[PDB]
Amino acid sequence: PFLSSPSNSVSTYYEDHGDARSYPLVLIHPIGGNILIWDYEIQLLLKSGFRVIAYELRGHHRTNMGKTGAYTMQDLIDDLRRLLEHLNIGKCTIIGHSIGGIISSMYAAQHPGKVDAIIMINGSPKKFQEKDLEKHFRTREVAITQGMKALAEHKLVSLDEARDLFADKRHADFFREVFTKTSVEGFVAATVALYTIPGNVVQGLRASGCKVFAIVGSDDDVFMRLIKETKEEIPEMELRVLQGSDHWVVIEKPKEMYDILMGFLAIVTKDV
Amino acid sequence: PFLSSPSNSVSTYYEDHGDARSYPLVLIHPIGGNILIWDYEIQLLLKSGFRVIAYELRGHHRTNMGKTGAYTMQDLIDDLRRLLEHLNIGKCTIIGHSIGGIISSMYAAQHPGKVDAIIMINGSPKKFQEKDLEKHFRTREVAITQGMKALAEHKLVSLDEARDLFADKRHADFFREVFTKTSVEGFVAATVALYTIPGNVVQGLRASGCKVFAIVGSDDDVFMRLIKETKEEIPEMELRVLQGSDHWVVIEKPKEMYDILMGFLAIVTKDV
């Protein structure tokens, strides 16, 4: 279904699975992702008795850009706020991958009464260092000049590196499926938006008192570093590292991630 | 005339005034500006024997956005590079107001062989503090929800303040003329782009060895602070303050600004 704003013309594609009386979980995909990345998780979480809400970010798959083609992270938080108001969600847990993790942290900070817990998968509440975002200049250039299918092909092969992004063609092909639904304008805007993350989200997230959980791939050097910094500042956070996983862990779907996830959700649902 | 890129579909509107053999000056307008803001200056500089190049930024007046609706400051530098290559400009002086000043500084840093001098009018090479950009959340919201004509009206009246943005209706009306040619998507994108200024432009500008000049209005608290910080770091810069002028000094056109400007240009042209 679609939630369309008359004021900014963004029409958010979303799905609301499960019974409306069940405990709601909100799934937020990464840059270049969409609800297709969550297929397994929607089925797993429904079988576990949750209501599962997933949506597509501006310019990703079925969601458009609206009146403008640039935005700040705050705009993405406001999109999520509007969706959860539309669905009459009072208290929920948010599961966010990469940018989805950042979004979850800012939402919790801004709406502490609305969130029991956040689960950030290769995400954090921190601003990036400039060096962390340098790579996106070249990915933007490929997206603009050559397009998204070309960009995916470049992401998938590493002539320079001892290995490709995924070892298994099946995972590569799942990534292709998902990534190539992203619009060029949406990819560009999302990557630019990363510069607009406020420097005080860690303080706000600590202030919220919501339960903070993180799952990080040991090979994701950027998010390892940021989440370790985050744990220094939010000692009540629960962090778990997946040895040998990297940024795109949601494509590979290692079993241990789900063992960890369901563990966390058991803690959250105990206290609800 | 237009310079259109086949790779990013940006079609830059520009004007190239004066004789092609004369010393070239490049004029870069602020966010919400366009070549209309430079009318007086084009005439003054032509009468002084310069070749005068002016252009419109992405999404401002006659320039479109291209394939995307978001970009980084680097993208704006690349647009300028393409324009000066198109016009076969080897060595020039750049006069930039506000964002135009920032652009001039990054261009000089990246292309030191191409620039004799930059003149930044309420601009600097520094990144903003977050607090400096907080105001643009509300101006973006007005632009998106109410439009640019409404935004101009809100900028022009200060119920809260001891005075309006301009004391003279004639200056207000000049501002209206100019500002309301800006597209909503262009305003939004430009303001977002401010977050993407690199933190090392001051070092690069100092490295370039180009002559650095700045004119700042004493009432422009943000740019006073940034340019003072810049002068600490680039002691060879020449800074002049206009007492009683503010950010939109290019609308008011005080005579002292031109006395200062022509002075600087005399220094630059002595060494050419």
Choose the closest CB to A69 out of B8, B140, B185. Answer: B185
Of B98, B50, B110, B65, nearest in space to B262 by CA: B50
Report the distance separating Cα A70 and Cα A110, nearest Å.
22
Interface test with B, best of A9, A134, A138, A144 (most B CBs within 10 A): A144
Take residue A107 and report the two structure tokens written for it.
């939402």
CA B138 to chain centre: 22
* Amino acid at site B182: T
- Whether A69 sits inside 8 A of B74 (CB atoms) is no
Of B63, B59, B83, nearest in space to B71 by CA: B59
Q: How far is B145 from chain A (nearest CA, A)?
A: 5
HEC secondary structure over chain B: CEEECCCCCCEEEEEEECCCCCCEEEEECCCCCCHHHHHHHHHHHHHCCCEEEEECCCCECCCCCCCCECCCHHHHHHHHHHHHHHCCCCCEEEEEECHHHHHHHHHHHHCHHHEEEEEEECCCCCCCCHHHHCHHHHHHHHHHHHCHHHHHHHHHCCCCCCCCCCCCHHHHHHHHHHHCCECHHHHHHHHHHHHHCCCCHHHHHHHHCCEEEEEEECCCHHHHHHHHHHHHHCCCCEEEEECCCCCCHHHHCCHHHHHHHHHHHHHHHHHC
Choose the closest CB to B69 out of A7, A65, A199. Answer: A65
Take residue A202 and report the two structure tokens written for it.
């860690």
Report the distance separating Cα B203 and Cα A100, nearest Å.
35
The pairing of strands A24-28 and A92-97 is parallel
Report the distance separating Cα A240 and Cα A221, nearest Å.
15
Choose the closest CB to A199 out of B65, B69, B130. Answer: B130
Q: Which residues contact A27 (CB under 8 A, 6 or more apart)?
A: A35, A38, A41, A42, A52, A53, A54, A55, A95, A96, A100
Take residue A44 and report the two structure tokens written for it.
């797993």
Nominal resolution (angstroms): 1.5
Take residue B56 and report the two structure tokens written for it.
């419109």
CA atoms within 13 Å, Cβ hemisphere of A31: 23
Interface test with A, best of B7, B73, B135, B144 (most A CBs within 10 A): B144
User: Residues before each break in chain B (C–N > 2.5 Å)?
Assistant: none
Partners of B211 in the β-ladder: B117
Q: Which residues of A touch B195 (CB under 8 A)?
A: 72, 195-196
- Whether A69 sits inside 8 A of B72 (CB atoms) is no
Domains and CATH numbers, chain A: 1-272 (3.40.50.1820)
Interface of B with A (CB under 8 A): 7-8, 65, 67-72, 74, 130, 137, 140, 144-145, 184-185, 188-189, 192-193, 195-196, 198-199
Technique used to solve these coordinates: X-ray
- Whether A144 sits inside 8 A of B192 (CB atoms) is no
- Whether B68 sits inside 8 A of A130 (CB atoms) is no
DSSP codes of every residue in chain A: -EEE-TTT--EEEEEEES-TTSPEEEEEPPTT--GGGGHHHHHHHHHTT-EEEEE--TTBTT---TT-B---HHHHHHHHHHHHHHTT--SEEEEEETHHHHHHHHHHHH-GGGEEEEEEES--SSPPPHHHHTHHHHHHHHHHHH-HHHHHHHHH--SSSSS-S-SSHHHHHHHHHHHTTB-HHHHHHHHHHGGG--TTHHHHHHHH--EEEEEEETT-HHHHHHHHHHHHH-TT-EEEEETT--TTHHHH--HHHHHHHHHHHHHHHHH-
